[PDB]
Amino acid sequence: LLFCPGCGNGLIVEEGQRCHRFSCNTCPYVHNITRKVTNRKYPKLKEVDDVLGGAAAW
Amino acid sequence: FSIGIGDVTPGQGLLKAKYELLNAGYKKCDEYIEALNTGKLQQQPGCTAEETLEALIL
Amino acid sequence: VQEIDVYLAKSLAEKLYLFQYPVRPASMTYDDIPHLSAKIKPKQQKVELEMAIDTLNPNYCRSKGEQIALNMDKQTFCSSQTTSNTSRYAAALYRQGELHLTPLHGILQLRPSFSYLDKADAKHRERRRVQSYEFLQKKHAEEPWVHLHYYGLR
Ligand SMILES: [Zn+2]
């Protein structure tokens, strides 16, 4: 979510010539090859445990 | 056949047994709580800490 | 123990009206001195200006053309007032040697007026209650004869 300076209506990327033309009054920042980065690191499934027979006697 | 409060009063041997068991049972549970939050506590295979702590409290 | 003293400066603060911008925090945006076409109301400011758009961003072009009205392109504002009781806030200009209190008038927020989509839909049509108050303003909205200019003043 990158907002518009001037109306503030949220990010829309047109895939023509790499701009950010919003649904309102055009403020297309034609970002050059600056590489977009959004790595939202997730979770990693973490191994397992054997659910042992150490305790069941009580 | 009759019941009374003499049939419920602990003798001398219970009180010195319960007093140590309430102390030595509370020293470890004070440490098992302290081994969790202050530092590193090993985990039972069921869940993480603060879940196997209670199963080791019980 | 900075014991700096606060003057209860009587320099007329009736003129002072705080303007707020819950719109321009991204890059310390200053509104910029050049733009004119200034229009302001005393009550419900509705600051209407010449926020002409740049052309450094590449033309914008057809969609601007698609806009229908643009008069370069006004990015006007309607003042969201918050003046219920308006003396709770009255601070002014403060050196490390002197401090001048001035009691302001009602603060007004200044979000961007659209009215392009408002008028745009009407155009398709061609193809509240006591909303303006009893006196229809007949004046506060008429008052916009405005000159934002630069002068060192107190
Ligand atoms: Zn925009």
UniProtKB/Swiss-Prot annotation, chain A:
Instruction: Tell me which family the UniProt entry assigns to this protein.
Output: Belongs to the archaeal RpoM/eukaryotic RPA12/RPB9/RPC11 RNA polymerase family.
Q: Where are the zinc fingers (C4-type)?
A: 4-27
Q: Which GO terms describe its molecular function?
A: DNA-directed RNA polymerase activity; nucleic acid binding; zinc ion binding
For this entry, list what GO says about its biological process. Answer: defense response to virus; innate immune response; transcription by RNA polymerase III
| Keywords, sorted A to Z | Antiviral defense, Disease variant, DNA-directed RNA polymerase, Immunity, Innate immunity, Leukodystrophy, Metal-binding, Neurodegeneration, Nucleus, Transcription, Zinc, Zinc-finger
User: Which medical condition is this protein associated with?
Assistant: Leukodystrophy, hypomyelinating, 21: An autosomal recessive neurodegenerative disorder characterized by global developmental delay, loss of motor, speech and cognitive milestones in the first decades of life, and diffuse hypomyelination of the white matter and atrophy of the cerebellum and corpus callosum observed on brain imaging. Clinical features include nystagmus, ataxia, dystonia, and spasticity. Other more variable features are feeding difficulties, poor overall growth with microcephaly, optic atrophy, and seizures. The disorder is progressive and may lead to premature death.
Changing R40W does what?
In HLD21; decrease in expression levels of RNA polymerase III-transcribed genes such as 5S and 7S ribosomal RNAs
GO cellular component terms listed in the entry, alphabetical order: cytosol; nucleoplasm; RNA polymerase III complex
Residues noted as binding Zn(2+) 1 in the record, renumbered to the chain: C4, C7, C24, C27
Q: Where in the cell is it found?
A: Nucleus
Quote the protein name from its UniProt record: DNA-directed RNA polymerase III subunit RPC10
From Swiss-Prot, chain B:
Entry's localization field = Nucleus; Cytoplasm, Cytosol
User: In which tissues or organs does this protein occur?
Assistant: Expressed in the brain, in the cortex and the white matter (at protein level).
Which superkingdom heads the taxonomic lineage of this protein's source? Eukaryota
How the protein assembles, per its UniProt entry? Component of the RNA polymerase III (Pol III) (Pol III) complex consisting of 17 subunits: a ten-subunit catalytic core composed of POLR3A/RPC1, POLR3B/RPC2, POLR1C/RPAC1, POLR1D/RPAC2, POLR3K/RPC10, POLR2E/RPABC1, POLR2F/RPABC2, POLR2H/RPABC3, POLR2K/RPABC4 and POLR2L/RPABC5; a mobile stalk composed of two subunits POLR3H/RPC8 and CRCP/RPC9, protruding from the core and functioning primarily in transcription initiation; and additional subunits homologous to general transcription factors of the RNA polymerase II machinery, POLR3C/RPC3-POLR3F/RPC6-POLR3G/RPC7 heterotrimer required for transcription initiation and POLR3D/RPC4-POLR3E/RPC5 heterodimer involved in both transcription initiation and termination.
Q: Which family does it belong to?
A: Belongs to the RNA polymerase beta' chain family.
Q: What pathology is it implicated in? A: Leukodystrophy, hypomyelinating, 7, with or without oligodontia and/or hypogonadotropic hypogonadism: An autosomal recessive neurodegenerative disorder characterized by childhood onset of progressive motor decline manifest as spasticity, ataxia, tremor, and cerebellar signs, as well as mild cognitive regression. Other features may include hypodontia or oligodontia and hypogonadotropic hypogonadism. There is considerable inter- and intrafamilial variability.
What protein name does the entry list?
Answer: DNA-directed RNA polymerase III subunit RPC1
From-to range in the entire protein, with total length: 696 to 753 of 1390
Curated annotation (Swiss-Prot), chain C:
Give compartment(s): Nucleus
What are the Phosphoserine sites (modified residues) in this protein? Answer: S132
Quote the biased-composition stretches of kind Basic and acidic residues, using this chain's numbering: 121-127
Query: Per its UniProt entry, which superkingdom is the organism in?
Result: Eukaryota
- TM segment ranges: none
Stated role: DNA-dependent RNA polymerase catalyzes the transcription of DNA into RNA using the four ribonucleoside triphosphates as substrates. Specific peripheric component of RNA polymerase III (Pol III) which synthesizes small non-coding RNAs including 5S rRNA, snRNAs, tRNAs and miRNAs from at least 500 distinct genomic loci. Assembles with POLR3D/RPC4 forming a subcomplex that binds the Pol III core. Enables recruitment of Pol III at transcription initiation site and drives transcription initiation from both type 2 and type 3 DNA promoters.
This protein's assembly is summarised as: Component of the RNA polymerase III complex consisting of at least 17 subunits: a ten-subunit horseshoe-shaped catalytic core composed of POLR3A/RPC1, POLR3B/RPC2, POLR1C/RPAC1, POLR1D/RPAC2, POLR3K/RPC10, POLR2E/RPABC1, POLR2F/RPABC2, POLR2H/RPABC3, POLR2K/RPABC4 and POLR2L/RPABC5; the stalk composed of two subunits POLR3H/RPC8 and CRCP/RPC9, forming a structural mobile part that protrudes out of the core and functions primarily in transcription initiation; and additional subunits homologous to general transcription factors of the RNA polymerase II machinery, POLR3D/RPC4-POLR3E/RPC5 heterodimer and POLR3/CRPC3-POLR3F/RPC6-POLR3G/RPC7 heterotrimer.
Instruction: State the protein's name.
Output: DNA-directed RNA polymerase III subunit RPC5
Q: Origin organism of this chain?
A: Homo sapiens (Human)
